[model samples]
Target chain A: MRERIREHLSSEESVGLLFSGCTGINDKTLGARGGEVIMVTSGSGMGKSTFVRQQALQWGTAMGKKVGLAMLEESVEETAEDLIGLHNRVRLRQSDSLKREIIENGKFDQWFDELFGNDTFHLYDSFAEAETDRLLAKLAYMRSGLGCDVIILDHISIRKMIDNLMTKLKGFAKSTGVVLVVICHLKTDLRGSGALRQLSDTIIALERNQLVLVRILKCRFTGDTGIAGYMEYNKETGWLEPSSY
Target chain B: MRERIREHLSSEESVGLLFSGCTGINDKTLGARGGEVIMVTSGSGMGKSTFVRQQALQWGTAMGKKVGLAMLEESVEETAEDLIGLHNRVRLRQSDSLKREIIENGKFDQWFDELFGNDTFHLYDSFAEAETDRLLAKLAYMRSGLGCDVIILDHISIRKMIDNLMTKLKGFAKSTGVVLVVICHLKTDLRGSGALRQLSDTIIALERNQLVLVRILKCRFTGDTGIAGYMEYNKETGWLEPSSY
Candidate 1:
């Protein structure tokens, strides 16, 4: 006990990217970390899923992180095409005309795989929505098995069943050394899903079609992001601009 | 100095309540203390104001903790009558049948006095609303000058002037031996206001008529989430249940 001063305070592996709303957060030691979940939430029919998709795309396309989306829908093919269409800036719904033409002409060959082929972008078709254990199983598979580095979960609703979800998710994120991203909806006007706020390393809530508010709900890197500002959303790309104010 | 074993841990003065949401928080040594600011918020028109008002009512009316309302940007009469209505189960929103009689007669007694007659529920009309100095002066006056042990600031959204307002408020709350409660709106769609989330002792986000989610944003007492669950708001009693004692 006399000579136990060596601390694991700062390690190279713990550094991660700050979210959209954390511009004025902990400046020098700002950002999330691996083994941490960054939760993004908003109201239904708002832009949470689209927002996180943009976030995942950013991380995968530019940030040098292998991004995996654990979509709510079991069929990964639909969302797979969705991301590809988004990348190409063409709105492709599930009953997409573009994919239909390609798949039907025996040229589905690389049409779908080309966009996801680099494998920087991954999707988990295995069902993790209803069960948490299966979710973790697939998460583990993605991390080590598929080498999926950053994982995005669509949501854990503000329900009583997933009451202890935050604590467990935080625990798993810490132990597994993977960055987890979660998306969910807000209650009435614009109130935080309180469950997500308790233990998440970072929480950024969004609003659609207005002067957006991007807030660094919690910053765990050095743990204090005294930053909040109005942001503008470019409906074109479905992205946020903090400087829009 | 090796076996000094010094502890100022339990002074009785440092004991306070843990936030409504924070299961397994500050386990061995949990709760809040005087000279601390606890920020609780929710969506507009949702029951946070009423929830906190009920909390203040409980603190002052039942538990013997003097509570004050700094109030949001609204009329004193509006809020006063609102509180009164909740108390007596009567609606008094001004433009009522009894206002002119009370004001005109030499009998403004029940009009103004009925709502705050006990004086346990203090109102800060002096100077807790504007700039930092005015706000601090009023806070100090409440703590030392008027014997107000607990004060609630309905909001601190004065402007973007004092951006790092929470830091100063936390400092002031720590220096002045009074528990402070501040209310605020989220950044956008359920986003955390970075200022309050970063420094406040406890942050509980609410969604009325649904499963309540309370969180210990920053636990100062042993520091953790001690309780998390669905809370039933008893409208008849104007109180939140599972006893926030």
Candidate 2:
């Protein structure tokens, strides 16, 4: 038996291990993890903002994680309203806990009213001209004070803004250990370009239909580097799922 | 006097006629005679949906031009909500007379309440299980029955349903005399290897910072082809204004 065990260990330099499957838990896959930078992109009119808002709500309030949104273009209140919609979707998805939380708060009427009115997600809009340094400082504050692990920079393509700022922002993201989601744009001569792919860890592009151009681009952190898939915006759900084409 | 007139005409020819601009506006620019197709693409999360919504609302209801939207992913209600927001913005920009008949019909309080409660844009969710025949039928109905001149198809992509029917759809779009706006996806390759560019009249792509990956792959009708200038989203107004790139 000892000899057999020794032979089994010695015969193979390495053995590949495979498991059938894992549990069907949505929680683990739903929330954002630290040290991730998710980049979403598409052509004009492809529903990028809605997509980001959905992601923010799914990871932040729905998953019970703190999220920080650095919206340079949109106001905080507008972002909050989008988040409120997301919170409602999550409540529907996890109704039991949502109902229990409402009941436990003895001000049932007030709680119920607020539950419908107030958005639980946190949003910070910096209408101030965004600079790399200023953004870094604000992110630092969010990390330290609010314990935020997920940070979404609404977008980084300010025409006059410094290009080097993005590189520095990436460095800051790495150093801070926060999952940073950066929204970027495409160039005119998209046929032959490597600048964006070189800069981003993941890239998502949005495309339009021949009838009415409404296309969204998506990229993730996984090893899949090329264009992952196309997503169409569902008006009913206000979400982007895989497109048929 | 004849000599002077002759000289004036020759000089006008050299410098271009004073009414030349007006001539182009009517003879060259005005009318949807040839049918126009506008495609808008960008990187993911850059607020493309809001941009399209603004365009539809501004040109369609706000400007009182009949517009038909073929929403593939989003619901009619969601699209209407966006329209309502856009309508409110446009109302703020215009005189009270410019308000839509629907808004004017209700009493001030009722109108305001309804406007706040309901979205203003009308859309069809048929794109979810959309067939080419159905889409064409709807377009025809909107144009003939509803007097819709501007037809917006949210997006066309390489999903199972769309990809399988692209060839037929493209042929139908070309044969139909409708102003079509189709959104398409972009490839990371940027090498023109993707098939999207083959069937477009105008391609407008959006990028972030210096990283240009998301692109509008094709456009044929207008000289306004190529890269779009940078734009920032306004939260309060929900407008995409040109950014100082």
Candidate 3:
């Protein structure tokens, strides 16, 4: 047993899916392990959606992980366009000039094919909120049928209902060996919801007034709870670059 | 009137006291003009106190303007020590090891004498919250008796009364040629209170989760309302250093 523990220490292998851009977070939390319920939270306009999209892009394209995106707030087309643009380091939704330029040159087709032709992305059709059980079933199907490794849920609602939803989500992650990344909106701080604090394997909070500050609320795997990193969101590029603090 | 307007444009002189560190803000808002209420606000631990302290120290020492400190939250000793420490680029309140060294080497007396010996700082005797009228009287006395050019009010309380207090505060600033620098806590955003929006000549809000983001809420002088700058707080020096975004 001691020899086995020594071997594990010597190898220094990270357990699960590594974060693409944020190497500091990857080192601290190791990675988003399988069956782990990772909660991403922040106030509105704090790049919560952007951060998840970046992670999804990396997982699907670079790491070759099957990624499922369940974005309730935006349409499937919007989501698809976003991923393609992000893959090419251009903001298709925001820049009409870039979109027009790409269409005129045959670059749009090239970029879209480069990102989407691989069949790594499995996007949910609906853009509206779903019932907890129904959502769970769809998520389960994505994991089992589609063989998706990482599933990203953009927004969750129903206040008191959120407590119950969190519990069920935790249960689902435990039952199925899928990396469930849930995005939540903060009313105030980490102490806002006890259920959120109790359930999530890792809780990352992105804060912004101008520049973004990414904080780790709780890391169950590493017991590291403080700042994860700082980010400055670029409007032109549609990217969150690492900011030194 | 035409010649005066032309001359004014040619001179291009700023209206009032310039911000020592933040030249970008000075360029936009002109400066903290007399007969103006400059409201500084943020969520707790967002460098509101530190920002104000830097301004006060610069006004008193560098600019040679009389400054009055009416800190309701902390004691007189604490405020005095903070200013002295800040003047010398040392965090006297935070670092005990340095405090011991300063005291042992007689550096404390030298530093204190340099800042306070000029009689530029007039600290209000009480650390507790006073009645609105009483506070007004004391503030008036600080301007009239002590001849302070700028006065800082650290914290304000009373929920519904805050509206009335803001009105009186604005009136006082307009009537007296003192730059009233009032610090307030944010419940959420700038739209939290209508009175705060309407009353002040300039409103600066600091937001921090880790690195601080300084947003100009309202600049009545220049009609500039957006982000001013970003700051990374240095623990060793107790200074909010400029951070690139």
Candidate 4:
């Protein structure tokens, strides 16, 4: 236990799973190591999915690892467009007569090279609905199958049926040596089928007031992550700025 | 043409597939009359996916119809939770030392009843990639085979290699009479390999300045849906407001 008690520093390959994009999220987890499950949640529409993707991207870029995105609600092309659009520093609008021409082709070409392909960003297309076993199996497959180091599950369904699944997710994390950034939603009651946190080595919760804010609900690795702040949305990079716009 | 116009009242169930929820996306082409390919686009981190889902929900609810969501980015469970969370008026925060009881109480049952089942919200789980033909074939199958009323594809990839695929999508929408809402990211340069817009009967674009905004870039049916307005984020429902937050 004492030998494992040393300070852990993330490197280019082995690293933190979530950081730098939002406030409370950044500090609480200080990033997750492989086998660590980082749990996140928010109110009904607090941009949980969006926040998860951006945070995962930051983790991927900062740590220089592959980000496996398992989105049962969106498609691969849509995700690709976002990653490309963010990297290129431009807005793509179908209605923009002025913007539709799509300038700076080179930037996108570069983004294509920099962020995706060659085992960088792997988008999962599993259509499993609430089958925890199948879902977890898919996450494990990404590690051995796609070489993905970080697994991002946009969220989980909170239910009595989900009680046992929480421990499985945490167990899977350590067994596979893959960092899991699992998302859950905030409830009015505070304890509404919320078990993801217990298994999470790090917990980051997002809230919306006029502007979105993040806070560390829990952390196991770094004391520095307990910090909190307001977040500014940046279209250029699909990220949140600590500073206000 | 006159008889065809008069018979297009949508009473037959085989009509335009895309329309409304905001300014530009509302009229133009007067909704997707089954098989018509509608195109939409926006920058990254601007909440395009979230907006699309909510708007589709609204259109489905108002028209009292079904919507087939073909997302390559999120999962059924997460989507279910969001839809149900909104329906239940409760937030499942990760740390709710109180809110987990909603578990056994049917978090998803009502959501499945309200938005999903009964052929209302059909989510596509096609695992195809850049293989345009396979993807398109699946889309076609979903309409004719699965009997899906509307087909929503968020943004098309405008690669030089994709020129032919866009025309194919256009043809499918017309020949099949399945309403198609295709999303395309805007670019700044002309001749940017975007044939989707050319194949589109209607086009909608989203933009983010200080706050997010939407505009009708083109509407073929009701004159210019070139309508424009600012959008605010609402945590309750994944929506954008015409007014500022």
Predicted complexes: DockQ each: 0.02, 0.01, 0.01, 0.01
Residues A1-245, candidate 1: write the lDDT tens digits. Answer: 00110111111233465444334532423455788778777767566776677667667877778887887653687667657756655555644676677677754555456566687987876564477777777777788877877888876567644546666677778888888888766662125544566567777666556466555555544333323556655555445555646
Q: Which scores better on DockQ, 1 or 2?
A: 1
Candidate 4, residues B1-245, lDDT tens digits: the string is 77887777644653354444454343344455655666667654456665666657665666766677675454444454444444444323221211234433543344446555556666665344667677787887778777767777854545544578778878888898777777665432242345755667766667764246666666555556644555666544444555633
After superposing candidate 1, which stretches have Cα over 4 Å from the reference?
A: A1-14, A18-29, A94-111, A126-129, A188-195, A209-211, A222-232, A238-243, B1-245
Relative to the true structure, candidate 4 reaches a TM of 0.48
The reply for model 4, stretches above 4 Å from the true place, is: A1-245, B1-30, B85-101, B185-192, B222-227
User: Which scores better on TM-score, 3 or 4?
Assistant: 3
Cα distance off (Å), candidate 1, residue B47: 28
| B27: Cα error in model 2, Å | 17
Query: Residues B127-223, candidate 1, lDDT per residue (tens digit)?
Result: 4345766677666777776777678877643234345667777887888768888887753222665556666777656653334555444555555
**Model 4 chain A worst lDDT run, 10 consecutive residues:** A1-10
Runs in model 2 deviating more than 4 A are A1-245, B1-34, B90-122, B159-170, B187-195, B210-218, B222-225
Tens digit of per-residue lDDT, candidate 2, span B46-84: 455655666665555445555678788766654553555
TM for every model, in the order presented, reads 0.45, 0.39, 0.51, 0.48
How far off is residue B170 in model 3, in Å? 1.0
